[PDB]
Amino acid sequence: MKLTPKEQEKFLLYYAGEVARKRKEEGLKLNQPEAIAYISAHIMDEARRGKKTVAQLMEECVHFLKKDEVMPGVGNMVPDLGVEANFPDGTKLVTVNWPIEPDDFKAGEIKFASDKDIELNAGKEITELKVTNKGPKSLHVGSHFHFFEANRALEFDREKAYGKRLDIPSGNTLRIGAGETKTVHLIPIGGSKKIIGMNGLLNGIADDLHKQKALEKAKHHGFIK
Amino acid sequence: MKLTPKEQEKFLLYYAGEVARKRKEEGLKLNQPEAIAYISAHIMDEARRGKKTVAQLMEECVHFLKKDEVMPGVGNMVPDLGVEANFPDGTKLVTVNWPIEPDDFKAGEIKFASDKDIELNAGKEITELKVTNKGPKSLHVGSHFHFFEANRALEFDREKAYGKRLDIPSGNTLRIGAGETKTVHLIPIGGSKKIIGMNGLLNGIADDLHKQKALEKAKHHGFIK
Amino acid sequence: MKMKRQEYVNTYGPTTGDKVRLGDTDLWAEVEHDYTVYGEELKFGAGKTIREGMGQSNSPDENTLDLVITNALIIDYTGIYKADIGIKNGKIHGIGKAGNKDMQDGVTPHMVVGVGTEALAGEGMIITAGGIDSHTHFLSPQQFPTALANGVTTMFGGGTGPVDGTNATTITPGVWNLHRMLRAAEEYGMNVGLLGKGNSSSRAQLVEQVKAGAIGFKLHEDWGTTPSAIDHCLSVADEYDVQVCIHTDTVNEAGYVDDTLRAMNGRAIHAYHIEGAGGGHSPDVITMAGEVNILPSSTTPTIPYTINTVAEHLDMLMTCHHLDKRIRFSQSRIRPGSIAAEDTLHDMGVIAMTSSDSQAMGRAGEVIPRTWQTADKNKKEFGRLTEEKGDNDNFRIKRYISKYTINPAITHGVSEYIGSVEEGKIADLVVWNPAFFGVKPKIIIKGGMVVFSEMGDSNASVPTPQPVYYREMFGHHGKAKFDTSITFVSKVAYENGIKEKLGLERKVLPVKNCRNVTKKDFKFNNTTAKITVNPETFEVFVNGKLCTSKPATEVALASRYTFF
Amino acid sequence: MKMKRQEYVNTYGPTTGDKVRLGDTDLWAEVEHDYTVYGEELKFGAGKTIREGMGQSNSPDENTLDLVITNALIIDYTGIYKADIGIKNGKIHGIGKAGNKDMQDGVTPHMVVGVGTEALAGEGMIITAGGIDSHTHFLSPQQFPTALANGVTTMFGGGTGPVDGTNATTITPGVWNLHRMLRAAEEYGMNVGLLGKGNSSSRAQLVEQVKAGAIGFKLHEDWGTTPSAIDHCLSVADEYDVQVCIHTDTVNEAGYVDDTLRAMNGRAIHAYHIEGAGGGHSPDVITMAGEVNILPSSTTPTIPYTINTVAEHLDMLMTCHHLDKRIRFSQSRIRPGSIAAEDTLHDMGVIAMTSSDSQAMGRAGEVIPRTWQTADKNKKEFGRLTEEKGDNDNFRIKRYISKYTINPAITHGVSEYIGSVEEGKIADLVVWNPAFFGVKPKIIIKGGMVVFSEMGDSNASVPTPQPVYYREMFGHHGKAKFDTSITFVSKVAYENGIKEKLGLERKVLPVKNCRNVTKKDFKFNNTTAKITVNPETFEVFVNGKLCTSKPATEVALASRYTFF
Ligand SMILES: [Fe+3]
Ligand SMILES: [Fe+3]
Ligand SMILES: [Fe+3]
Ligand SMILES: [Fe+3]
After folding, report:
1. Domains delineated in chain A
2. What residues of chain D lie within 8 A of the CB of C240, using their CB?
3. CATH dotted code for C1-129+420-477
4. Among candidates D136, D169, D130, D171, which has minimal Cα distance to D152?
């Protein structure tokens, strides 16, 4: 047989699916592991039959188990499911979003203090700036990237972006499509404003003293046209 | 699924139960591991249905497999069975006494040389003593405990119990219920009679020389009233 | 900029004032404080915060963290708050706001995220200390994966393996057996500490064991828990700063409960299965829990009190102790009264710890679920604690978490190293998804490394595909396990080079400050009272008021999560 | 029981809400919190608290303090509060409530008063951290007793002795001179750190010095503070994590102030005598103080600004620099503007540190008095700070204490060891009587031992009889001075066994985290602004508003306390 360690895993998953099937046939509402194994075994079966595409299965398995076919809170506990199976074209990953239909019960439920919005970067002075991606390809810029050092494809008043970053949620990026024009909101960088790296236009404190040197380096390197 | 190593064990036990069920359906007499797995899977099934109590299952599973449903000697080989299963109130231990009905065949049978009783503590002089548990709670006293040092709740002529132990089988205990009166049979302690520990009334050889000191300590500590 | 509350919570997890449901229980944890600066939160990923010269510093710093647990919701006796956790040199380096002071406001000075920092996203996760199971019977090495899979990182107790002595008692008796077990311990990821035989009325035999590496002694009735034994054992423990654990004289052979308490003479002692079903003076052992010097714990089978608890025991006692089938009952009248009271005593902070009694009248991977099932049961029966401030169960949560984290650590003399989420302590932490809190952990960190975690298909294109099951990680393997695991010993053994002498490669640390830990020393479970048992009805009384609870028909963190 | 407020304060010192006048100044310190339990306060003496089995424990504990400072009023950037201070192993073990948990309520767990604990009554006393003087010219070993007698425990700077180079600059130049001085340091009670010659346009010569043990470099105009020198020096400092101190080009030979600032290139640098009378670009060196990368200090002669400050300088400059009597003035028009502004800049938190310039245009035993004289002067002129909350000067006090304690420690990379009254730090503390605060200390503790104190007649029946004068204590003598004193070195030197190689018996510790300390890193003195000087009027401007102060006709902590 030459059973690989991954094949040995799949036997257990498949057997768990078979036990879950038996319990559903008995009329029992399936729990979290039973529900996952029941859907996993279906995917593994269809893959072996090699008549359905990954695309077909991803669609077919949404709400494969209905809210009344599982215990309360099971649907919300499993927002997505992933199962690798061998298809005629090889092993492919079947990714299902909402495999089990949710209900009103939620384990690990978060109840907010207030529905009021969170004021991020509070008290920082906003700078409105028009930017144009004159490049042939779209690009994104992160929340903490030194805006002044962004891809030379971006056309904007760089002097006004010196020592500033995007006033967007931490970890988010702003997209500027090829040819697209946008109004960005910039705020001054926190801490000491010791900008080291990126495009190396600054590599030091973003003070007035470093500004002329930084603008000259930006012009020389093609960021300022 | 987040399968714990204990859940992985239970899948094997459950599958073994399913194979045993198939073999019984074929009309085959189940062997020792098949019989255990067949009963185990039933318990695991009933627990998941969550309609029966542990008490109900313990009773239901006595002679769950009949002598003719198993190979000879199987019942005798499995005098008791234990299986932990998840009930709606959590994991509980289902303990079954005589799960498989025995037959007159016995593997590993002990055949006695004689049916005549074994004379324990042979040649030791028996001392009959009246004891009363004047305490509010019942108590037991072991075969090798120095009787003289027993719970002060026990009322008896302690002088007569000095350097003696109960003439009962090794490992057995004698119960004296709250308020109960009994006639105990005491025999002198074996070996050197070097009594160290328990209530520390003696802590040395139980000779005539140590007796007065021991009786005074017993009186002082409240054993002798 | 103004961020929608739902979007903030999805991205960074809950903030100040938000309430989190613990698993499927009715317990609500409220975020007491958030240590972040809104807009400066660390996020890992493509185009995110933790990047060269941005959230990640380019400036070398002596406090560059080895690991950062971003946006964690800490649940500990110290508080229920939101913070970034910084690990360095296998210890909790800092708790607060991590990042780069060069580009960010409000960064905790000793929480530098740099080139050498690994990232772990804790946003939307609950971070707790690793559990300490102080009632382990070292019966089977297979208990260790089961324990880790249930958030337990440290195990105190004793054994030799599947032998009658161990099967019954947490005892590794004598020098040779202690040395053998301490050398066997090298194999595992679990932190260990061994107890020797305390059942002796002779000094020498007890001293030999402490010097052999024992972290204490277990006095167990199977070896005779007589008043002479109790006194001799405590005397040696006092001399050597080690803990004593006790299973009292069930049959009241040498005396009643008060006679045992008298023998102890106000000395520090850890009372196992205080309720008494697991063993001890019948029917009044529970009365010991009221005493200041008594450090009491509970074993898993009696917590919570369910409709099957009594039935299960009236047979489970016969398999463990190997009793005649002629014995039917006494336990049927005694047991309901004390099992019920025990749950309320936990809620009152009278019983300070929860333990397992693993494969010896108790379950290895059940300490954590059963503690939270009891917390939930009481909340459901008695309602929200009067002690609570606001629409939350923070006080109850803190009372219950202390039972398996800090309080066992205080009892065993390891509170300076482990037991809680505090700066300076060893990084033995557990990451939980709130929907699975108390039932199924995500990641187990020991000594700053991941040692055990839930993991999917080994071949798979991502770590999520099925079957997802618990597996050993890098920190549990090779010579890295010697860097992440601790073998606790007595000070005498430690100071006399037990590590070198036994050729132990694991971290060897001494247990210290065991002798002067009273009820007053615990966290959220310092309650002392006059506990009495009616010898006719078997009802339990706390200062004259009947102490009881109703049996549960169903429990939380059970049926929804398990296959079998 | 009800105790009269006056009687409580006499017995235990001030409690929450009480205000203490600092010396004869108009500065009022308010007790923010008291860590005691009323009725459980520790008192030492016959029939008092600290006695066997009472306030002093009979129970052995791993946290038994070596020393207890009972009922201390801590004045530190961390807060102005009332607490017991516990010392163990020459470090601040704990801050809170000390005593015996066996007999007392509310005892801080790691603050055990036991058989091995010494007692020091701090009731009614102010306890502060030992001062750090970061501008020492190692000219005379006689500066050390003068420094200690004024609450200074650490001294950074340089020298060889009474030679022209040292007389002018804080520089111990080259390997041989550095080794000689580090070996000379063994003699003293004072913590030391030496700076080498930073005035080099060649790498090798700078590297040799760091490897020889230097904690940094001093760039001084006497050896030419050219832009080439500034760049080369900072480059090596950045590589080796050491601090750079600067005395700028007074005569603007190679460039103006902006040319110097440009050469620095936003790199961390300690700017000595920022006002400019002590030296630096005339008339605009003060303009550097507005910059984020510039860590500025003041020297004692210009603080506070008095009616004799200008007159004293127009001659003190001629004795130090050895100038012709043909030179009359320029300093008469330039100096009033910057000397006046300097005092206000201190009050605004623009100038972060105060230093001495000892026997080289500044006084050794004047750092502490002069800081408080300036604090008092400003309070008297500008009134209570707007930043203050309540009828107190707590914020101003915290701003000023940081100038000679924490801020010099942060600058020089020793903040992890010394600088403040915090758990884990070395026990370098000063005990003050409130009537003599800032002018005359009572006891100087270094590494948990008393090293220097005010002491009366050596023959006398008690320690109080006259003449009471400052004397060296046991911690300053024998081999105990090696246990209480630190010689700070670079990491390179430390890691390469400088201690062993030079046969230094003193505690040798490395300076770390110097390169990334900006203005933002300081405590209560993080102010950045656009500082400008009118080149015609010499007036100083902070963001366009005239920055000035009036000269004092009399100062606090002076005439009432000194004979001469
Ligand atoms: Fe037990
Ligand atoms: Fe046990
Ligand atoms: Fe100078
Ligand atoms: Fe100088």
Report:
1. 2-103 (3.30.280.10), 104-225 (2.10.150.10)
2. none
3. 2.30.40.10
4. D130
